[PDB]
Amino acid sequence: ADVQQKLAELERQSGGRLGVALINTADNSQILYRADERFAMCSTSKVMAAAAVLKKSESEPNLLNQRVEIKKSDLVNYNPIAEKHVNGTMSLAELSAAALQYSDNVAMNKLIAHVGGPASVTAFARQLGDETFRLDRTEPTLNTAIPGDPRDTTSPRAMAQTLRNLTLGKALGDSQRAQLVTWMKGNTTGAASIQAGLPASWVVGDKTGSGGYGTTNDIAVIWPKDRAPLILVTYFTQPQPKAESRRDVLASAAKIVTDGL
């Protein structure tokens, strides 16, 4: 209850909409705040796309080594890795890492294309038992995050449950699950988000997202020191189209729901 109140307080101060789902695998409990509302996933959707490629690889040896051409026409709005490879190839492993660890958008588009498009990523989510996730478009338009628009959204509850399946459960084979977690633990974009609300000794694998309407997201698998793992989704979005990102709100939310663990 105290946690409920404190999240409400943080929401009020922030001026936006906050969605939180914590799963504590110590005792199979959850902390939920607007966990059944929809939020634009933005780049947090890249976990699902990388996982779909990993799943495909279980029946296609060496798929992760398959090369993909990067052409000027592939560049989009945010290309931190791909812009270094124009007019060469990158492997699907390389693209997965770039999508997950740098939030590269070309890399996401290549993962999307490889598996058959947004509807294929969505069908993979369904196959896992996630009936909430929907990836409707490609990069960069999937990040518009317009209030009231259900495209490219999920709920905090659904994303937490799916991320626990992917990272701690059996959605993926052991090699593929380890590769996903390795990639996420190597993320470079999350240090100001959930990470920033946890003790320094805790280990985190996370994926951030940023979008229109100051949308600021993070989904994480967390290994606290000497404790069973956690799954945490913190989604946040704002009323103004050009609102500035608020990674600090995610850090605050993470502190509130884990303080006292």
Ligand SMILES: *[B@@]1([O])OC2=C(C([O])=O)[C]=[C][C]=C2[C][C]1[N]C(=O)[C][C]1[C][C][C]([N][C][C][N])[C][C]1
């Ligand atoms: B995606 O949501 O991930 C992402 C992040 C992130 O992980 O936090 C940061 C920067 C870019 C990206 C790529 C994806 N998002 C977008 O393509 C839209 C986003 C909108 C805000 C932009 N920065 C504006 C600063 N005035 C960057 C692109």
